[PDB]
């Protein structure tokens, strides 16, 4: 059948300030079917207890989910989102870049 691969954005809820608590978001959208695996990473390792929104879909029937966790950005720590889906031959990693 016809499948749609996810778009992925990784970003913070509030403007990032080192040492200030915030939320790290990974928004996955545009995908079909709805089964998807999303991890948030800190220095390459999976963050535990990440929460996600309730499954819903856009006007074009593609699904979207927000995965999120509290974090405190620092100068040294790197954050990313890792996504797997039936349309991807390997997990896709998108790094958090505070300018995006």
């Amino acid at each position: 059948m016809i499948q749609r691969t996810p778009k992925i954005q990784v970003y913070s809820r509030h403007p990032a300030e080192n040492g200030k608590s915030n939320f790290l978001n990974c928004y996955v959208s545009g995908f079909h079917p709805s089964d998807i695996e999303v991890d948030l990473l800190k220095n390459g390792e999976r963050i535990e207890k990440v929460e996600h929104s309730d499954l819903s879909f856009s006007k074009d029937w593609s699904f979207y989910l927000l995965y999120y966790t509290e974090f405190t950005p620092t100068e040294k720590d790197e954050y990313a989102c890792r996504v797997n889906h039936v349309t991807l031959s390997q997990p896709k990693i998108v790094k958090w870049d505070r300018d995006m």
Partner: peptide, 15 residues
Amino acid sequence: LVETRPAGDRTFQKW
């Protein structure tokens, strides 16, 4: 133009 995205606090973001 990125897709409009949820901040998690009711609001949205775009660039």
